[PDB]
């Protein structure tokens, strides 16, 4: 239902090389010590809003969670966005899809209805950040292997970008789709990003090693206005 995300979701905000500096940035981050919702499809898949972004992380064993749909009305009036993969290339359709109430896999679901454009390209942790200003669609990622009992580690993990898509769609809901062998036509962690002000620490090779967020407690404001990690 609810768990903690300790220092979790830090991504690169640009493509600029900085070394041995203490930069201060302001963007849409997932705030520290927040309450993320941890789902498991036992009995499911609800639909979840898309406020300013979604920090997505999951616990993979055998290629179960594959992709997400990003809808707004879901009655084939307004466009949406489908991002799936089938171990050959990731495929991104921006069509007005045949949206049923539960997706699945034929272990093949791909319609052709007025598509704008297409793109073709507890062991391991695979986290993702999706943020969508109207004009772009940015996806960040990071791969690292974890060996803990249930939860997220307390180490620091910079999330490098992979693609950026010029889209321009209002996205008000989103819904994932995981591996089903059944084929029906029946009639993972989610956290939301907020505008915060972070203090990032670059070293040589250009790597952000630890960050300070400002709005957490008073000692955080002391560290930010001193531009320091020690007080």
């Amino acid at each position: 239902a609810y768990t903690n995300s300790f220092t979790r979701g830090v991504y690169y905000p640009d493509k600029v090389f900085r070394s041995s500096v203490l930069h201060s940035t302001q963007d849409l981050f997932l705030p520290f010590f927040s309450n993320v919702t941890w789902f498991h499809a036992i009995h499911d898949n609800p639909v979840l809003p898309f406020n300013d972004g979604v920090y997505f992380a999951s616990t993979e064993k055998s290629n179960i969670i594959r992709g997400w749909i990003f809808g707004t009305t879901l009655d084939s009036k307004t466009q949406s966005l489908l991002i799936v993969n089938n171990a050959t290339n990731v495929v991104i359709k921006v069509c007005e899809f045949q949206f049923c109430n539960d997706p699945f896999l034929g272990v093949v679901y791909s319609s052709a209805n007025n598509c704008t454009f297409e793109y073709v390209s507890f062991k391991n942790l695979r986290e993702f950040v999706f943020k969508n200003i109207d004009g772009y669609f940015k996806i960040y990622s990071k791969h690292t292997p974890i060996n803990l009992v249930r939860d997220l580690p307390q180490g620091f993990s910079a999330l490098e970008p992979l693609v950026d898509l010029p889209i321009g769609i209002n996205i008000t809901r989103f819904q994932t789709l995981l591996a089903l062998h059944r084929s029906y036509l029946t009639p993972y962690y989610v956290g939301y990003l907020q505008p915060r002000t972070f203090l990032l620490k670059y070293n040589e090779n250009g790597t952000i090693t630890d960050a300070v967020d400002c709005a957490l407690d008073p000692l955080s404001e002391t560290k930010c206005t001193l531009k320091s990690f020690t007080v």
Partner: protein
């Protein structure tokens, strides 16, 4: 007068010019949006995204007949040199008494209810009238007249509801205090200038940060490797030496920054090579001299520079031959303050005459040369200490010395109004 003087930069230097660009595929679709007879009207405009173009802007502001060409963050002559990261195009047709409203922060019904440029707009607005195709009374062109509130920048909203003002529910049926927004234009050749139909294209781009996709029609040049140029990488311009870098970027990173938001390294857009950027003036020069009534010999100190890179630091190969005498020679001395050229180093020690720094002094001393030495602190001495010996004095002197102390200074007075605005009343 005798001393040591920091001197500003008066040395002349010539430079060359470099241009680099990526390999972009094909010429740009500008034959579409300026020739298309099927234009829209302002209440529903069309956004066309442009990418991977080599767009020659200069054959359209010169080789065309346009009424008003107004660029807002850029200049028209510089458009051929830049790269724009994303370009949009917007086309409609309206009356030419309101072409002043395609501008930032303007007001009026076309600006309040149809099309709103933001206040920090960067792009161009191009207009030229029509009296053949957008007239005949041609009734193909709408514009909204009523709205509950103003529009936000770069927004469009088509809703053919009916607009109520007073105390009557008007849902689907018209009536009193209730209107229909989309009332059209009347365009006739029975008119003069002012009500004639005009075409308007608005281009908007972003010059800030991405890999570049739309560029200009300019062709590349070589890389001239440790010489001051006017370089141009993807549109980001500068001036200085291009040093070979060994930095460790990431696959997405394109350039580097120091503290002060300046650019100190960059990626070449063709050969994918990282190369360092460094300024070139070298205004860290000091000149040691005795008086000019004494000699015209000088020595030159180059601040925190090792003595072998003095010709490369000051760009000695491009100076006058009366400067290049001081870039190397017989008298070359390396101190911890820098490289001292023009004074020869001796092994005695004297009191300080001209302070150079870090224990080194200089003097004019026997032909007459300039010598450099380590300064002495005084005469070495030793007291004859034992546990039962004393020294008592037997005579004395009477000494008279002199101390000078400043007590006051001059009392001045300034009439502000006569200094600033002297004997004038408009000031």
């Amino acid at each position: 007068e005798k001393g040591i003087y920091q001197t500003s930069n008066f040395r002349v230097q010539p430079t060359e010019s470099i241009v680099r660009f990526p390999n972009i595929t094909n010429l740009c679709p500008f034959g579409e949006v300026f020739n298309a007879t099927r234009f829209a009207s302002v209440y529903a405009w069309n956004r066309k995204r442009i990418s991977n173009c080599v767009a020659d802007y200069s054959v359209l502001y010169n080789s065309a007949s346009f009424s008003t060409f107004k660029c807002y963050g850029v200049s028209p002559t510089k458009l051929n040199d830049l790269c724009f990261t994303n370009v949009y195009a917007d086309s409609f047709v309206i009356r030419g008494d309101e072409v002043r409203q395609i501008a930032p922060g303007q007001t009026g019904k076309i600006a309040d209810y149809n099309y709103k440029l933001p206040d920090d707009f960067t792009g161009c607005v191009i207009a030229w009238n029509s009296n053949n195709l957008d007239s005949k009374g041609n009734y193909n062109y709408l514009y909204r007249l009523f709205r509950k509130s103003n529009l936000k920048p770069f927004e469009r909203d088509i809703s053919t509801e009916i607009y109520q003002a007073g105390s009557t529910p008007c849902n689907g049926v018209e009536g009193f205090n209730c209107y229909f927004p989309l009332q059209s234009y009347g365009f006739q050749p029975t008119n003069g200038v002012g009500y004639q139909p005009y075409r308007v294209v608005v281009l908007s781009f972003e010059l800030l940060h991405a890999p570049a996709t739309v560029c200009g029609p300019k062709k590349s040049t070589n890389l001239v490797k440790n010489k001051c140029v006017n370089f141009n990488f993807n549109g980001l311009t500068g001036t200085g030496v291009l040093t070979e870098s060994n930095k460790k970027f990431l696959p997405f990173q394109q350039f580097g920054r120091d503290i002060a938001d300046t650019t100190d390294a960059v990626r070449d857009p063709q050969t994918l090579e990282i190369l360092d950027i460094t300024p070139c003036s070298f205004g860290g020069v000091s000149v040691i001299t005795p008086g000019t009534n004494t000699s015209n010999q000088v020595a030159v100190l180059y601040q925190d520079v090792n003595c072998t890179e003095v010709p490369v630091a000051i760009h000695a190969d491009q100076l006058t031959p009366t400067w290049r005498v001081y870039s190397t020679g017989s008298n070359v001395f390396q101190t911890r303050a820098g490289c001292l050229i023009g004074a020869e180093h001796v092994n005695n020690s004297y009191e300080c005459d001209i302070p150079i720094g870090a224990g080194i002094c200089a003097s004019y001393q026997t032909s007459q040369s300039i010598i450099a030495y380590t300064m002495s602190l005084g005469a070495e001495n030793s007291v004859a200490y034992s546990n039962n010996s004393i020294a008592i004095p037997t005579n004395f002197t009477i000494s008279v010395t002199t101390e000078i102390l400043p007590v006051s200074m001059t009392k001045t007075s300034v009439d502000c109004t006569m200094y600033i605005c002297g004997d004038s009343t408009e000031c």
